[PDB]
Amino acid sequence: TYQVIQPINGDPFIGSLETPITSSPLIAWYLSNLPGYRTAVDPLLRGIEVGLAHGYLLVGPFVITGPLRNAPNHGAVGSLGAAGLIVILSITLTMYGIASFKEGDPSTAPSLTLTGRKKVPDPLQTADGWARFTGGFFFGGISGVIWAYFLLYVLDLPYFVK
Amino acid sequence: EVKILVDKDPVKTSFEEWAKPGHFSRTIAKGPDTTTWIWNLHADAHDFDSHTSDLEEISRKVFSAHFGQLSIIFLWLSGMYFHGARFSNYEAWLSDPTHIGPSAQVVWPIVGQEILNGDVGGGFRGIQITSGFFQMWRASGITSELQLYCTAIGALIFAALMLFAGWFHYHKAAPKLAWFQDVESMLNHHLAGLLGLGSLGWAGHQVHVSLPINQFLNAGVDPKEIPLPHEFILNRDLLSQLYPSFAEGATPFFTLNWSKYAEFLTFRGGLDPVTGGLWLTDIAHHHLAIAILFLIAGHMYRTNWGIGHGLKDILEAHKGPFTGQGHKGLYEILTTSWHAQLSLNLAMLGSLTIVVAHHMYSMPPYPYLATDYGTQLSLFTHHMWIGGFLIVGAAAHAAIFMVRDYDPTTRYNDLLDRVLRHRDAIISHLNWACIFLGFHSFGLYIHNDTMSALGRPQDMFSDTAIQLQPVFAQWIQNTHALAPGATAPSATASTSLTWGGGDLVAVGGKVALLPIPLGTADFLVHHIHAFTIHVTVLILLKGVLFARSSRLIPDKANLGFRFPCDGPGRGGTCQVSAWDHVFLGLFWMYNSISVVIFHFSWKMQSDVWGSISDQGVVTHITGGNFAQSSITINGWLRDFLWAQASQVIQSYGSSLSAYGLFFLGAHFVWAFSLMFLFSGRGYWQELIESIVWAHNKLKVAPATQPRALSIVQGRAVGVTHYLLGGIATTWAFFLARIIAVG
Amino acid sequence: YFGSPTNLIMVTSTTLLLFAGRFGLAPSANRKATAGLKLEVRDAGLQTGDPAGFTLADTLACGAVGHIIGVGVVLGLKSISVI
Amino acid sequence: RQLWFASKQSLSYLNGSLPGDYGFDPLGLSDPEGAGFWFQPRWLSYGEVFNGRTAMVGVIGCLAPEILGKAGLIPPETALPWFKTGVFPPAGSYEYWADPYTLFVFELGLVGFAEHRRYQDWSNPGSMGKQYFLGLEKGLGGSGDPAYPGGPFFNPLGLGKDEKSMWDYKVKEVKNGRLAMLAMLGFFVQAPVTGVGPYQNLLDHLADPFNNNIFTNFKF
Amino acid sequence: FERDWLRTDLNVIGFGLIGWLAPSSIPAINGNSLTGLFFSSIGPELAHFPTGPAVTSPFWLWMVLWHLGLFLTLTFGQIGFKGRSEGYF
Amino acid sequence: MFLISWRGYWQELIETLAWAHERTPLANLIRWRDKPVALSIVQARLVGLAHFSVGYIFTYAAFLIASTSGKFG
Ligand code: CLA
Ligand code: CLA
Ligand code: CLA
Ligand code: CLA
Ligand SMILES: CC1=C(/C=C/C(C)=C/C=C/C(C)=C/C=C/C=C(C)/C=C/C=C(C)/C=C/C2=C(C)CCCC2(C)C)C(C)(C)CCC1
C-alpha cells in the first residue's frame, strides 16, 4: 500500500525515523530559515537575531509576575530582571564556548547534506564563530529588552495586558 | 463448527501427589537441599505455563482454579449473610436507620477484649461495620433475619456446587483446547447470557419484590407488617394499589403502550428525599434497558450459522497509511496467550473499579447510604485500592507476555512491531511530561508554602490571590446542571446533585449531597493526580517495552521475566528486569491512590458532609477549611494529618481502641519493610554463617541449610510489608475518624 | 387493536425485512457482506427446503430485527404525536 | 427421509438408525466427537424415550381428575386441577392419610430403589440379574439396550416379536412421547397465565374462541 | 519521505464541508439547526469584543458540537476517497 | 529514592533521554562533553544515606528548638 513513516534518509539502521513532524516540507523550510541553521552567514548576525527575539520575549513574565508587579515601578524592575537573565545566559554561552572549542581546531559541524553533497561546515562550531555568536546574542538581548520596555512603558500603547 | 469437546478421565484423583511437595515442577520435585526450596515451592505454585508447555493442559488448570475461586467467594458471601442473620442488629436498624449504627460482629469475653462491643444503638453491642450490607439488604427488600439465613444456606450450596464443578472439570470432563478458543461463542454468551439475563432477572426482582416493599418502608409502616414478597405475586390486587397500571397486566408491553408503565418505570434523576439515594423506579428502568442492550449486543458474532461477525475479519480490515498491516495477527495472539488476555482484562477491570468508586459516591444507589459517611469513605477507598492493584497487575502480565509468548516469526503483528521500533520516543516524551507535570504541580505547593512562610499571602496561588480556576470542569458542571431543560428534556433532574443544580438533600439532619464547588485548590490536586498517574504509567510502560532488550542488555529476554540483575557490569545493572519495574510501580500506585483518597476525605469532610438544623443552616465537619488550607503542604500536615488523627490517638479505652492498635501496628510494619528494602542478602548470609556455627557447636544444625532470601524475594517482602503497613495506617485512621466524628 | 397504525407498522416492518432477507437484499446465512457492503455467496450447509436457500436462522434474525425497527418507529411516531 | 431443519453437522451422525429421526439437531447436542457423561449420543436417546414415557402418564395424571369430576364419577373434592393437589401449596393442598413431607420420603425410597436399579443396568448391562433380589432378579437382567429391557415384567405381552413391528412401535412411542412432552410444557405455561386447569382452559376456548387465547390472556 | 504525505485532493475539503452543512442545517432543534444555532451565537459574542465569551455562554456547546461533526465528515471523506482507490473496502 | 530504586532502571531511562536530545532540533547544536550515566551502586548508597541523615537531623532540630521555644519549658 502507501506507508507514510520511512527510515531516516533511507537508512534503516540509523537511530531515527522520518515522520511528518520531522520531514514535512513546511517544517523543513521553517527550520532551515531559522537563524540557528543558517550555515553560510556570519554567526554574529544570527546571534543578534536570536538575542533580539529572546530578550524581547523575556520581558513579559518578569514585569507581570514579579514581586513588584503591583508597584508603579513594575515595568522598569521587570525589564532590569530580564536584562539580568540575559546577562546570565550570555555568561553560560561564553562558558560553553570556552569549554567546548579550541582556537585552532576546525568545525565539528557535519560536512554533508541529506543528499550526500559536500558543503562548508558551519563556522558556528568553532571558537571564533561561537564567540561572535554569543557577543551578538548579548547585544541583541539587551536591545530587545530595551525595545520591549520602550514599547510598553515609554509610549504606553494600549496593550490589553501590561 | 462450535460444539462441546471434552476428554474423559484425564487426571486420576489420588492423594499420592499430595504427599510429594513440588510435584508440579521438575526441579522442585527432587526435595530440598537448602531453605530456598521452601520459598521456590510457593512462588511457582500457580505459574502453570512454567509447569507444562501444553496449552490445553494449562487452560484446564486455569478453568478449575476459577471454580475454586468462585467457591471461596460463595463461602465468603454465605458467611456475611449468616453473620447478618445471627449476630446483627439489622431488624432494629430497619426501624431507625438514621440513629442506629450497623453492626454484624460480636466479640467473645476473653482477656478483656469485650470492650470492642460498643454502643451501636438499638439495644445492641458490637463492632460497627462499614461494608454497606445493611443498605443493600434494605434495597433488595430484605425485612427479616430468616431470609438472610436462607441466603446463607443457598450460598453454601452454591459453593459446594462450584467446588464439585472444578473437580469434575479437571478430573472427569476436561474441555479441549478448541473449546476454550471458541471466543465468539464465549463473547456471545457472556454478553447476552450472563449479563443480559442477569440484569433482566434483577429488574424483575426489583419491579416485583423491591419496589413495593421499599414503597411501604418509605411510607413509614412497620417492617413487621409489610406483606411478604410472594404476597405481591399471589394476589395482584396488592400490587394494583401501589401502582394501578399493574391491573393492565402485560397487555401494554405487547401493544407498545409503554407510557402506561410510567408509575414504576421513570426517568427522574436526583435523589429520593426520604431516602437520600437514587429512585428505585429509576434503577429498575435502568436495569431493564441494560438487559435489552446486552441481549442485542450478544448477537454480533458468528458461531455456527451464517449471520454474525468474525473477530479476525474485523481485526484484519483496520489498517492505514501510518499503521501498516494494522491489527492483522492480533486474533492469533489473543487466542494463544493467556497472559495477554489476563493483562487486558486486569487493566479493564481495574479501570472499571475506579469508575464504580467515583460513581457510587456521587449517585448513592442504596437507601440511607449517603448519610452513612463511614460506609461511603470505606467503599470509595476500598474500590480505589482494588482498581490500582488490578491496573498494576495488567502491566506485570503484559511484561510476562512480552518475555515468554512474543514470537515475531510465527505470531507477527505490525502494530506491536512498530511500537517496539520507536519506544525511545515514547519513553522520552513520557519522561518530559512527568517532569513538567511534577514541576508545575508540586512546585506550586512549594511556592505557596514559601510565600506563606515569608509573610506574603498575596503572592500565593489561591482564591484570594493569583487564581487558577478550573474553567473547563466548571463549564462541564454548568452544562450538566442545565441538562434537564435543554439536552435531556425527559429527565426531571440532573444525574447528580453535585453538578450545581442549587439544591441539597438532607436526611435525618444530615447532608446527603450538595453542589461541590471547584476552585484553585482543586486545580492543584487534580494536576497532582495527573502527575502521579503519569509517573506510574511511565514506570510500567518502560518495563513492558524494554523487557526483551535494551541498548545496555541486547539479550534481556534470555535472562527471563523475573531476574535480579546482570551483574555490576556496565556501571551497574540492578533492577533491569520487567519484574523490578512492577516492584517500583507498586510504590507509585500506592502514592497516587493515597493522595486521591486523602483528597476525597478532606473535600467531603470540608464542603459536602455535615449537619443541618431546623433553621436552614449547614455546618460541615471541618467547616470549609479545604479551600484556604489545602494549598500548602503545611496545611495538609496541620489541618488534615495532625487535626484529624486526634481521634485514632485518643481511642484507647473505648470501642474504637482496636484502630489505635492497628495504627501502631501498621506504622511498625511499614518501618519493618525498610530493613528489607535498604539492605542486601550478602550481609545476611554472612551473618547467618556465624549463627550456623553456634548451632553446629551444640549439634543443632539443621540438614536444610539456612539461606538468606534471594535478591528478588527480599524486594517482594519489602514492598509487600510497605504496602500493607501504609494501607492499614490509613484504614485505621480513616475508620476511627469517620466513626467518631461521622 | 387490529388495523391500528401500530399494528400496521409492525406488520409492514416484519414483512419488508423478511422479504429483504429472502430476496438477497440483506445479509443472511448464505450471503455475507464484505467491507464495502457487497454481499458474497457463502455455503452455510444448513439446508432449508426453501428454493432460495432461506434458512430458519434467517427467518428468526429477520423477524427479530424487523421487530426492533418496528418498535423504534412506533415509539417516536407517537412521541412526536404523529400517531 | 423427511428432514426438519437439518444441517451438515446433523446429517453426519443422524443416519436414520434411531426411531423418530428427522435430522433435527440445530445445536449439535448429539455429536459423537468429544462427547461424554450427560452429552453423549447414547444417553440422550435414552433420556428422550424415558422423559416421553413419564410425560405420557403425566398428561393423563393431570387430566383425569378434572375430567372425571366434571362428570358425576368421582367426588367433587377429589377432582382438582393438577396444581391444586398439594404439589404447589400456594395454590392449595389436599389432606391425605399422610403428611405431604412424609409421603415424599416414602416416594423417595420406593422410586430410589427403582431408579438406582435402572441406572446399574445402564452402567453395567447384565449386572442386575445376578444378585439376589427376592427372586425378581430372574426377570431384571435387561436386554443390552437400556431403554428397551423387555422380559417377563417390562414386556409381559411379548409384542414386537419380529423386527418390523418392534421398529414401528418404537417410532410410535417416541412420537407420542414428544407430543406429550409438548402437552405438559403447555400445561406448565398455561397454569400461571390462566388460573384454571387445562380442561377448563379447553372448555373455555370452545365456547367463545376469539376471546380466550394468548392475545386476551396478556393481562394475567 | 514523500513531499505531499497527505496526497491533497482539494475536492475532499469541499465535499466534506457541503456534506456537513447540508444535513446539519435541517431544522430539527425546536425549529432551529446546529449550524443555525452556532452561526447565530457567533454574533452576540462579537458584539462585546474584545472580551471573550462567558463560562455560561451557549457558544461553547454549539461550537463543539458543530466542529465535531465537521471534522468527522472531513476525516471520513478523506479516508473513503483514499481507501476506495487502494482496495481498503 | 536512592535507597530503594537501583541503577539499571535509571541507566536504561538515561539512554532514551540521550536519544531524545540527539534528535531534537535547535538542541543538536549543543553537545555534552561527559557522557551522561546513572550514579554508581556505591555512590547511590552514599547519596541516599546523606539525604536520610540530613533530613533526620534537620527535622528533629527544628522540632526540638521550636517545641522548646514556643513555651520555654
Ligand atoms: C469469610 C467467612 C467468614 C469469616 C471471616 C467468619 C468469621 C467468624 N465467624 Mg463465622 N461463619 C461463616 C463464615 C465466616 N465466619 C459461615 C459460612 C458460617 C456458616 C456455617 C459461619 C458460622 C458461624 C457461627 C455459627 C459462629 C461464627 C463465628 C465467627 C467468629 C469467630 C470464629 C472463631 O473463633 O472460629 C472458631 C475457631 C475455629 C473454627 C478453629 C479454627 C480451625 C482451624 C482449622 C485450626 C484448627 C486447630 C484447632 C482449633 C486445634 C484443636 C484441634 C484438635 C485436633 C486438638 C469470626 C468473626 C462465631 C461468632 O461470631 O461468635 C460470636 C460463631 O458462633 N461463624
Ligand atoms: C449463558 C451462558 C453462560 C453463562 C451464564 C456463563 C457464566 C460464566 N462463565 Mg462461561 N462460558 C459459556 C457460557 C456461559 N458462561 C460458554 C458457551 C463457554 C464456551 C465458549 C464459556 C466458557 C467459559 C470459560 C473458559 C470461563 C467461563 C467463566 C464463567 C464465569 C465468569 C465469572 C463470573 O462472572 O461469575 C458470575 C457468577 C455467577 C453468575 C454465579 C452463578 C454461576 C452460574 C449460574 C453457573 C453457570 C452454569 C453454566 C452456564 C452451565 C452449567 C452446565 C450444566 C451442565 C450444569 C461465569 C459463571 C470463567 C470462570 O470463572 O470459570 C469457572 C472461565 O474461566 N466461561
Ligand atoms: C486475577 C488476577 C491475577 C492472576 C490470575 C495472577 C496470576 C499469576 N501471577 Mg500475578 N498479579 C496480579 C494479579 C493476578 N496474578 C496483580 C493484581 C499484580 C500486581 C500486584 C500481580 C503481580 C505479579 C507479579 C509481580 C508476578 C505475578 C506472577 C503470577 C503467576 C504466578 C503466581 C504465583 O505462583 O503466585 C504464588 C502466590 C504467592 C506466592 C502468594 C503471595 C502472597 C501475597 C504476596 C500476600 C498478600 C497479602 C495479603 C492480602 C495480606 C495477608 C495478611 C497476612 C498477615 C495473612 C500467575 C500466572 C509471577 C510470575 O512469574 O508470573 C508468571 C510474578 O512474578 N503477578
Ligand atoms: C519526596 C521524595 C521524592 C521526590 C521529590 C522524588 C522526585 C522524583 N522522582 Mg522519585 N522516588 C521516591 C521519592 C521521591 N522522588 C522514592 C521513595 C522512590 C522509591 C519507590 C522513588 C522512585 C522513583 C521512580 C521509579 C521514578 C521517580 C521519578 C521521579 C521524578 C519525577 C519527575 C518530577 O516530578 O520532576 C520534578 C521534580 C520535582 C518534583 C522535585 C522537586 C523540585 C521542586 C520544584 C524544587 C526545585 C526548586 C529548585 C530547582 C531548587 C534549586 C536551588 C539550587 C540552590 C539548587 C522526580 C525527580 C521518575 C522519573 O525520573 O521520571 C522523570 C521515575 O521514573 N522516582
Ligand atoms: C411466504 C410463504 C410462507 C410464509 C412465510 C412467513 C411469512 C414466515 C414468517 C415468519 C415470521 C413472521 C417470523 C417472525 C419472527 C419474529 C420474532 C422471532 C420476533 C422476536 C421479537 C423479539 C425477540 C423482541 C425483542 C424485544 C423485546 C422483547 C423488548 C422490546 C425490544 C425488542 C424488539 C429488542 C410459508 C413458508 C408459510 C409458505 C411458503 C410461502
Please, could you describe this protein's structure?
It is classed as photosynthesis. This is part of a larger assembly, with chains A (162 residues), B (742 residues), C (83 residues), D (220 residues), E (89 residues) and F (73 residues). Chain B is mainly alpha-helical. Helices cover 56% and strands 4% of the residues of chain B. In chain B, strand 3 (118-119) and strand 4 form a beta hairpin. With 83 residues, chain C is mainly α. Chain C is 48% helix and 11% strand. In chain C, a hairpin with a 2-residue loop joins strand 1 and strand 2. Chain F has two helices and no strands. Chain F has helices at residues 7-22, 41-71. The two termini of chain F are 38 Å apart. The chains are: A mainly alpha (162), B mainly alpha (742), C mainly alpha (83), D mainly alpha (220), E mainly alpha (89), F mainly alpha (73). Chains in contact: A-B, A-E, A-F, B-C, B-D, B-E, B-F, C-D, C-E. The interface between A and E is small, with 10 and 7 residues. The complex binds chlorophyll A (4 copies) and beta-carotene. One chlorophyll A binds next to helix 1, helix 16 and helix 22 of chain B.
Secondary structure elements and their pairing?
This is part of a larger assembly, with chains A (162 residues), B (742 residues), C (83 residues), D (220 residues), E (89 residues) and F (73 residues).
Chain A: E1 6-7, E2 17-18, H1 20-23, H2 25-32, H3 43-65, H4 74-100, H5 127-153
Antiparallel strand pairs in A: 1-2
Chain B: E1 6-8, H1 36-43, H2 48-51, H3 55-86, H4 90-95, E2 103-105, E3 118-119, E4 125-128, H5 133-140, H6 145-171, E5 173-175, H7 177-180, H8 183-219, H9 231-234, H10 239-242, H11 251-254, H12 280-297, H13 311-316, H14 330-334, H15 338-362, H16 373-404, H17 414-420, H18 423-453, H19 471-481, H20 483-486, E6 505-507, E7 510-513, H21 520-545, H22 578-608, E8 610-612, E9 618-620, H23 626-629, H24 633-644, H25 657-678, H26 681-697, H27 711-740
Antiparallel strand pairs in B: 1-5, 2-4, 3-4, 6-7, 8-9
Helix pairs in contact in B: 3-6, 8-12, 15-16, 16-21, 16-22, 16-27, 18-21, 21-22, 22-27, 25-27
Chain D: H1 8-13, H2 41-70, H3 100-123, H4 151-154, H5 163-193, H6 198-205
Helix pairs in contact in D: 2-5
Bound molecules: chlorophyll A (4 copies) and beta-carotene (BCR).
One chlorophyll A (CLA) is lined by residues 63, 66-67, 70, 180, 182, 185-186, 189, 193-194 of chain B.
The helix/strand series of chain F, from N terminus to C terminus, equals HH
The total count of strands of chain A amounts to: 2
Strand fraction of chain A equals under 5%
Q: How would you describe the shape of chain A? A: globular
Number of helices of chain F: 2
Q: What's the multimeric state? A: part of a larger assembly
PDB class: photosynthesis
Keywords: Complex, photosynthesis
Entry title: Cryo-EM structure of the red-shifted Fittonia albivenis PSI-LHCI
Chain A: Photosystem I reaction center subunit XI
